[PDB]
Structure 1
Amino acid sequence: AVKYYTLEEIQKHNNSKSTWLILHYKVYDLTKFLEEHPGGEEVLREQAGGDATENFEDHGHSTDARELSKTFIIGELHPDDR
């Protein structure tokens, strides 16, 4: 199955409430992880509500972070959208 979520929402979910990002067209909520993340919130929150796919890869994130990303999957970025 899929859950889907629209760019409308994904942009919106970006401000200390929910923080959503697109990593390979799947949609990833963190919000709590913002606390943990070595990269910090700000930078991530600013990539949030958009495609952070390239950026995520660019940083060369580890398997554990990748794994984490799987469990963070809430959603997908809608088809009408893309």
Structure 2
Amino acid sequence: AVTYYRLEEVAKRNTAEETWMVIHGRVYDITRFLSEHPGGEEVLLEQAGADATESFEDVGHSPDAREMLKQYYIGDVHPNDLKP
């Protein structure tokens, strides 16, 4: 039973205390990654709660970073929130 979030709840996690992001319709808690993030600490906080999809793809991220993504996954965006 995969879990769901809602953009709204996602959005509440705009801090360093707790960092969430949405990439390709999956939510993540990046909280712990920041320090590891080769491209920056500030870039991500710059988009907490946000759907950085467009952003992360516009910076080109590798398959390796993609794979890294799997460890910070917390769920997917609510279907009803999915934008089709």
Which ranges of structure 1 fall in alignment gaps of 5 or more residues? Answer: none
Report SS of the residue matched to 2:46.
helix
> Which structure is higher in helix share?
1
Q: How far off its partner does 1:9 sit?
A: 1.5
The 5 Å alignment of 1:20-59 reads: 20-59=20-59
Q: RMSD between aligned alpha carbons?
A: 1.3
| 2:28 alignment partner, SS class | strand
5+ residue gaps, structure 2, are none
Pairs aligned (count): 82
Seq. identity, %: 62
Instruction: Find the residue that maps to 1:21 and give its secondary structure.
Output: strand
TM-score (norm 2): 0.85
What TM-score do the two structures reach when normalised by structure 1?
0.87
- 4+ residue runs of structure 1 moved beyond 4 angstroms? none
